[PDB]
Each structure stands twice: as structure tokens, then as C-alpha cells.
Chain A
Amino acid sequence: KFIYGDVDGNGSVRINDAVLIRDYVLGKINEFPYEYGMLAADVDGNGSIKSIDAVLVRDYVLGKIFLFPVEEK
């Protein structure tokens, strides 16, 4: 059903998901193009969408990590 990091709801975590988060944090856009986008976007799991969320999604794409902080323990 939803995947952490996938804020556009296409089924894959990609670079544009990171940039959507970033553009949301910066106030360039005001929502995500996906009904579970807000849920998918809070990948550090601290309850808000912040610059670090976009960095963590980039790190997923780079292959630095497989699990997001929201997913561990």
C-alpha cells in the first residue's frame, strides 16, 4: 500500500521524491500529489516534514541506506 520515501505514489523511491520533499519544506509546493504522501514523507519519524527528510530520501536513492529511521526500532 504505501512505501516510506514514495511521496508521489508511483511505487518507487526516486530522486524526484527527495526533491518534492525539499520543495515542500521550502514552501514551493503545499502538498504532495498522493493521498499517502505526508505519511511517506516523514522518513526520520519525528512527526513533521523537514529538510533532513529530503536528505534521507536522497541517501536511499544513493544506496547508503535501505531502512529509514522511521522504520527502525
Chain B
Amino acid sequence: MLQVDIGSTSGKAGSVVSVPITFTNVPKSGIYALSFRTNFDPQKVTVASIDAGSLIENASDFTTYYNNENGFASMTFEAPVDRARIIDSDGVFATINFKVSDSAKVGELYNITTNSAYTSFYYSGTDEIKNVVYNDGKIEVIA
């Protein structure tokens, strides 16, 4: 079963930390389309940027957006209609770069969680990958 991990990390107040989104046990038949949305508390962290990871062969297939008011970061992948590029192997899909609030306190732990309404994975235009398992992310504020 496809495993989707929001990475965990640590950083100090005011720093930029990197949260990779990793796919493990990707089905050999491949992912034709997906969306992935993470929620966060914007009083604790904000999105600074999102980078394509190494699974993205062509940037035209990958789109991203974030909203630092309501607290989410979204990513989409859409394979070309001729299936010339498809995600069929394991790796980093994307990396979210989060800015840790200036008022963050040592020992706080912030949660980066998968939004199930806006997250889905497809073999094809009609067939969903149904047994994906997700692991959410932790950002630990350190000194």
C-alpha cells in the first residue's frame, strides 16, 4: 500500500524549516493524478515556498498553492494524457518550506496534518487508489 509521509523536523523560532512529502511503496501501475493538502496553524508556522521533489520529471505536471491566512498548503500532479511520465517509483514528491513564528517557544510541537477532503490519489481518470496510508508531520521548536 502506498504510504504518504509528511516529514518531521525541528527548528528555532524565526527559522525556515523543510518538510518533505515522501511516497513509499508506490504502486507499480503508477499514479496518474493526485492532490495533497496539508493543514497547519498559521499563528505557529507559515508557508515560505513549496519545491518540486525528485519524483517530478516535468514541472508542467506539478502545481502548488498555499494560503497563510486559513492555513493550508496544496500540491497537484497530473500525468500527461499519453502516460509518458507517471509516478511509479518511490521518493520525495515535494518539499514544503515553513517559516517558524518569531514568537515560537522552545518545547512547542506543531502539527502538519493531511486534509482528507482535498487529498486523493488516482491510477487513472476513474480509478482511485483507495488504501493509501498517511503519516502526519511534526515541527519541534528547539533552542
Residues of A within 8 A of B (CB): 8, 12, 14-16, 18-20, 22-23, 26, 28-29, 33, 58, 61-64
Given A8, A28, A58, which contacts B63 in the complex, CB threshold below 8 Å? A58
Q: Is the interface of B mostly helix, strand, loop or mixed?
A: strand
For the complex formed, measure the closest distance between the CB of B61 and the CB atoms of chain A, giving whole angstroms: 11
Q: Tell me which residues across on chain A come within 8 A of B32, comparing CB atoms.
A: 19
For the complex formed, measure the closest distance between the CB of B63 and the CB atoms of chain A, giving whole angstroms: 6
Asked, given contacts A8-B126, A62-B76, A63-B67, whether A28 binds B34 with beta carbons under 8 Å apart, the answer is no
| Contacts of B63-79 to chain A: CB distance below 8 A | 63-65, 67, 72, 74, 76, 78
Q: Tell me which residues across on chain A come within 8 A of B110, comparing CB atoms.
A: none
Is the Cβ of A61 less than 8 Å from the Cβ of B122? no
Given A12, A16, A26, A33, which contacts B117 in the complex, CB threshold below 8 Å? A12
Q: Tell me which residues across on chain A come within 8 A of B35, comparing CB atoms.
A: 14-15, 61-62
Given A15, A26, A29, which contacts B122 in the complex, CB threshold below 8 Å? A15
For the complex formed, measure the closest distance between the CB of A2 and the CB atoms of chain B, giving whole angstroms: 18
Q: Tell me which residues across on chain B come within 8 A of A22, comparing CB atoms.
A: 78, 81
A55-B77 Cα distance, complex, nearest whole Å: 12
A61-B34 Cα distance, complex, nearest whole Å: 10
